[PDB]
Amino acid sequence: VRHIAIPAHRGLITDRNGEPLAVSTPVTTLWANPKELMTAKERWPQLAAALGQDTKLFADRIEQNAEREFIYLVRGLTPEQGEGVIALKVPGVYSIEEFRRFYPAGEVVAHAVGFTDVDDRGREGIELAFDEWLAGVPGKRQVLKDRRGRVIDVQVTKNAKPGKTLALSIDLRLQYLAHRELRNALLENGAKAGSLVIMDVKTGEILAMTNQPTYNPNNRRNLQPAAMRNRAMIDVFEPGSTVKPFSMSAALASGRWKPSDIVDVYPGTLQIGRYTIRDVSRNSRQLDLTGILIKSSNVGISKIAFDIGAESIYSVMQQVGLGQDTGLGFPGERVGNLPNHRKWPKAETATLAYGYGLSVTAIQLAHAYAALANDGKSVPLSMTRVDRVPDGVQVISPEVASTVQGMLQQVVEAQGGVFRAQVPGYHAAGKSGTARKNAYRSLFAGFAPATDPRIAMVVVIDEPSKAGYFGGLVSAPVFSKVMAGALRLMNVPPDNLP
Ligand SMILES: *C(=O)[C@@H](NC(=O)[C@@H](C(=O)O)c1ccccc1)[C@@H]1N[C@@H](C(=O)O)C(C)(C)S1
Ligand SMILES: [Cl-]
Incomplete structure (x- = not known):
C-alpha cells in the first residue's frame, strides 16, 4: 500500500x-x-x-x-x-x-x-x-x-x-501595441534595449509593461537569460531631465516661485568649482519657468534649486516614489535610491535637480507621472485587475500639480517644444530626457488627455546608434503612436478636435 x-x-x-x-x-x-x-x-x-x-x-x-x-x-x-x-x-x-x-x-x-x-x-x-x-x-x-x-x-x-x-x-490590446511600437523603435534606431510602461492614472493599474529584448516562453530552447529580464522593474537608471517637473513642483510649493518668474541662463553654462553645468541650447538669457522646461535648461533648473534648496526637491521625489519600494512584490524588482547628504553642496544640488545621482525604475517613473496627472494624488500600484480602487495618497498639492501639468502641456505643444510627442486628436503633456551612461538613454515621460488625464506612459530606449538620439527624437514619437492607439482603444473622448 x-x-x-x-x-x-x-x-x-x-x-x-x-x-x-x-x-x-x-x-x-x-x-x-x-x-x-x-x-x-x-x-x-x-x-x-x-x-x-x-x-x-x-x-x-x-x-x-x-x-x-x-x-x-x-x-x-x-x-x-x-x-x-x-x-x-x-x-x-x-x-x-x-x-x-x-x-x-x-x-x-x-x-x-x-x-x-x-x-x-x-x-x-x-x-x-x-x-x-x-x-x-x-x-x-x-x-x-x-x-x-x-x-x-x-x-x-x-x-x-x-x-x-x-x-x-494588463490590457492585451494595449500590450500588443506597446510591444510592436517599442520593437519598431529599437530596430529603427539600432538600440540595444528598451522599456515601455503604461499606467491608469485613476486606478493604479499597469495597463502595459513591455521590454526589448524578449523571449518566447513556449520554447525551452530560447530561454537565454539576457532576454528574460523584466527591465521595467528589475533595471535601474538615472532619469535625467524627466525629473525636472518634480524639481519644478518643489519650486512652486516653496512659495518663492511662480510660472511667470524669470531666470537668467546666459551664457548657457554655469561653473561650480571643477564642475560645469551645461545646457544643450546656449542662445538664451531670460527664460520663464515654463521656458526652462520647454528648452530643458539645466542651468535654469540649477539656479532654482540653489534658491529653494535640495531638501525640498528630495522630499517631492521621495513622496512621488522615486527610489522607494513600490510594494508590488514582483520577483527581483529593484528599489533604486535617492542619494542622501547631511549638507548638500551646490554640485550635488544641481545634478539632483536635473536627474543625476539617483537611480529609478521605469515603473517608478511612470508611477510618479501618474500621481502628477492625477492632480498630485498617488494611487497604489497594481498588477492585478482593480475592481474596487484603494484610497490614494496626496503627494503633491492639487494646485501645484495642476500648474505643472499645464507647463508640461506647453512643452509638448508650444514652439521649440517636443512636437513629436503630440497626439493627434488629443492634448498631451510630458517631458523629454537624454541621460549619459558616449552612450545614452533616450527618454520620454508623459500623460494624456491633458484636460482630464487617463493614461501615464514612460518610454526608455538604451543606446540608440543612428544620428539623432535625443529623447525628443527617439522616444517621443513612440509616446505619440502608443498613446494615440491606447486612448482610442480605451474609447477616451478626443479633447483636441478642430
Ligand atoms: C536632461 O537629460 C539634459 N541632458 C543634458 O543636459 C546632457 C547631459 O546629461 O550631459 C546631455 C545628454 C545627452 C546629450 C546632450 C546633452 C537635457 N535634456 C535633454 C532632453 O530633453 O532630451 C537635452 C538633450 C535637451 S539636454
Ligand atoms: Cl535596488
Whole structure:
C-alpha cells in the first residue's frame, strides 16, 4: 500500500478583459518500472525507437537502473503521442496525466507573466509571485503494488483541488501595441534595449509593461537569460531631465516661485568649482519657468534649486516614489535610491535637480507621472485587475500639480517644444530626457488627455546608434503612436478636435 500524486490543474491567467495569457494543457508523461522491463527485453528496441533514443544507450540505461522500481522515460508528451507508446503494450511502461503551461501571447507578455517548472511550479514573474494562489493542491491516490513493484489502484485518499484564476491589470490590446511600437523603435534606431510602461492614472493599474529584448516562453530552447529580464522593474537608471517637473513642483510649493518668474541662463553654462553645468541650447538669457522646461535648461533648473534648496526637491521625489519600494512584490524588482547628504553642496544640488545621482525604475517613473496627472494624488500600484480602487495618497498639492501639468502641456505643444510627442486628436503633456551612461538613454515621460488625464506612459530606449538620439527624437514619437492607439482603444473622448 503506497500513494501516488494526483496533479492539480493550475489556475488560468488572463488579461484584464479575460483574454488567456497562461493556460495549463493536458500532457502525458511516461515512466517505467525497470524490474518489469527486465522481463521483456525483446520489446526494448521498439520502445527505444518510439522515444527517438539509441537502442544500445537505452538498453544500457535500463540495465544500470535494474534494481530500481521507478524511473522516468519522458515528460510532457501530447496525449495522442503518449498513447502511441502506450499502444505498443510494453510490460512495465506506465502513464501519468500531468498539465503543462502554454502562453498564447508568447513573448509579447513573457516578462510580466514569467514561466513554470517541468513540475508546473512558477519560477519567474507573476507565475512565481502568485504561485500559491495559482497552484492549487495535488491529491493522493491509494495504490497497491506487488513486490516488483508492479502496481496492481485502490481509491482516491485525498482529492486534487485546482488552482484559482487570476486576471492581470494588463490590457492585451494595449500590450500588443506597446510591444510592436517599442520593437519598431529599437530596430529603427539600432538600440540595444528598451522599456515601455503604461499606467491608469485613476486606478493604479499597469495597463502595459513591455521590454526589448524578449523571449518566447513556449520554447525551452530560447530561454537565454539576457532576454528574460523584466527591465521595467528589475533595471535601474538615472532619469535625467524627466525629473525636472518634480524639481519644478518643489519650486512652486516653496512659495518663492511662480510660472511667470524669470531666470537668467546666459551664457548657457554655469561653473561650480571643477564642475560645469551645461545646457544643450546656449542662445538664451531670460527664460520663464515654463521656458526652462520647454528648452530643458539645466542651468535654469540649477539656479532654482540653489534658491529653494535640495531638501525640498528630495522630499517631492521621495513622496512621488522615486527610489522607494513600490510594494508590488514582483520577483527581483529593484528599489533604486535617492542619494542622501547631511549638507548638500551646490554640485550635488544641481545634478539632483536635473536627474543625476539617483537611480529609478521605469515603473517608478511612470508611477510618479501618474500621481502628477492625477492632480498630485498617488494611487497604489497594481498588477492585478482593480475592481474596487484603494484610497490614494496626496503627494503633491492639487494646485501645484495642476500648474505643472499645464507647463508640461506647453512643452509638448508650444514652439521649440517636443512636437513629436503630440497626439493627434488629443492634448498631451510630458517631458523629454537624454541621460549619459558616449552612450545614452533616450527618454520620454508623459500623460494624456491633458484636460482630464487617463493614461501615464514612460518610454526608455538604451543606446540608440543612428544620428539623432535625443529623447525628443527617439522616444517621443513612440509616446505619440502608443498613446494615440491606447486612448482610442480605451474609447477616451478626443479633447483636441478642430
Ligand atoms: C536632461 O537629460 C539634459 N541632458 C543634458 O543636459 C546632457 C547631459 O546629461 O550631459 C546631455 C545628454 C545627452 C546629450 C546632450 C546633452 C537635457 N535634456 C535633454 C532632453 O530633453 O532630451 C537635452 C538633450 C535637451 S539636454
Ligand atoms: Cl535596488
